[model samples]
Target: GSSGSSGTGEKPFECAECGKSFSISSQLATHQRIHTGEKPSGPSSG
Candidate 1:
């Protein structure tokens, strides 16, 4: 399966605070920072 599972409507990750889910783990990682009070250090700031 070179194209991966190719399955749609699959939410493997769930958020407890917002009751929202994501299909990929990377999305969950970005969402977690929102809860942890971490800001994105943009180019303007850095």
Candidate 2:
């Protein structure tokens, strides 16, 4: 995905899953939930 200065490219938060870019890491983390649906319920942790 390294096309060389196409987008703003100012953000440090890059999606490791979808290779997308986000200004804030918080939103990037949120993106993972939508992209991967990783809402863990902590089921049966004994």
Candidate 3:
């Protein structure tokens, strides 16, 4: 069997702050916002 989203495999994207593993680099960067108190920008935040 194979997994796409969640799988116990070799993840390259590792978070430096929380030491979390993500399959994609963007996922890791996104997770970092939690510790840095950063939020993603959107057009609906008006």
Which 10 residues in a row give candidate 2 its minimum summed lDDT?
A: 37-46
Per-residue CA lDDT of candidate 3, range 1-46, in tens? 8867766566678776766788887888778778765555645345
Model 3 TM-score, 2 decimals: 0.45
- Between candidates 1 and 3, the one scoring higher on lDDT is 1
Each model's backbone clash number? 0, 0, 0
In model 2, where do residues sit more than 4 Å from their true spots?
1-10, 36-46
TM-scores for every predicted model: 0.50, 0.45, 0.45
Predictions in order: lDDT: 0.73, 0.71, 0.72
* Model 2, position 18: C-alpha lDDT score: 67
How many backbone clashes are present in model 1?
A: 0
Cα lDDT, model 1, residue 30? 92
